[PDB]
Amino acid sequence: PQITLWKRPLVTIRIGGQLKEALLDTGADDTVLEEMNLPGKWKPKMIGGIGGFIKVRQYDQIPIEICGHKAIGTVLVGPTPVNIIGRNLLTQIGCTLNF
Amino acid sequence: PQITLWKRPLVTIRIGGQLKEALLDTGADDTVLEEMNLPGKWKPKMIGGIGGFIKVRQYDQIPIEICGHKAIGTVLVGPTPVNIIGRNLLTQIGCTLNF
Numbered sequence: 001p002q003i004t005l006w007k008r009p010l011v012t013i014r015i016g017g018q019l020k021e022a023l024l025d026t027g028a029d030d031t032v033l034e035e036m037n038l039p040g041k042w043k044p045k046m047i048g049g050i051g052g053f054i055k056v057r058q059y060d061q062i063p064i065e066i067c068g069h070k071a072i073g074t075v076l077v078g079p080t081p082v083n084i085i086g087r088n089l090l091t092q093i094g095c096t097l098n099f
Numbered sequence: 100p101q102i103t104l105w106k107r108p109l110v111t112i113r114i115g116g117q118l119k120e121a122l123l124d125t126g127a128d129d130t131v132l133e134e135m136n137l138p139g140k141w142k143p144k145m146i147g148g149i150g151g152f153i154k155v156r157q158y159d160q161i162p163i164e165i166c167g168h169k170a171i172g173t174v175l176v177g178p179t180p181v182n183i184i185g186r187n188l189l190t191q192i193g194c195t196l197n198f
């Protein structure tokens with residue numbers, strides 16, 4: 001598909017047995033999801049953006065389906081105001097910027 | 100061009116006669132550049148990201164040439180972690196997401 005940018009590029013993702021709305025975010029190196037109690041091991045991490053840093057939990061090898069395209073990789077979980085699909089998963093679903 | 104996402108989508112922009120590197124950021128509503136001087140009146144504004152809120156200066160109707168494509172629109176200036184081209188200008192240059 002092609003997604004224009006008049007509005008936020010929110011799409012449906014499926015992770016850990018839940019469907020969620022998330023931004024397709026070319027400015028995000030990593031994928032950052034709203035607080036959720038995912039199973040398995042994790043590592044603490046702090047990530048920085050506008051306003052400063054937040055603390056997140058890094059889960060690896062998590063299956064995430066994005067608009068019917070399967071992905072698997074690292075997901076960071078923490079108190080973000082929006083779910084963010086970052087480049088680590090965008091590349092896996094074949095996403096490019098075009099102009 | 101078509102830009103893949105295995106690396107950060109950084110491009111050269113021209114603004115006020117100066118060349119800068121900036122990130123094509125589909126998760127940013129607005130364009131925000133690190134501290135710099137721009138001519139004309141500005142309005143104080145606050146914007147919020149993953150780490151909270153910052154104060155910025157809002158300059159309106161500013162020409163920016165982004166990887167050879169012309170835009171004229173709102174540019175925020177303040178303590179962003181990196182130079183960001185957001186959707187307000189991405190739309191002007193005809194940028195879409197494709198997968």
Ligand SMILES: CC[C@H](C)CN(C[C@@H](O)[C@H](Cc1ccccc1)NC(=O)OC[C@H](C)C(=O)OC)S(=O)(=O)c1ccc(OC)cc1
Pocket residue numbers: 025027028029030031032047048049050081082084086124125126127128129130131146147148149150180181183185
């Ligand atoms: C440093 C470049 C940018 C700021 C990184 N961020 C991605 C941005 O696309 C980020 C995504 C986001 C949107 C809304 C609320 C919170 C986050 N955009 C963002 O902060 O936009 C804030 C507002 C809406 C704006 O337009 O400001 C100019 S991030 O902070 O969300 C982020 C940081 C590290 C990551 O992985 C290491 C992933 C995401």
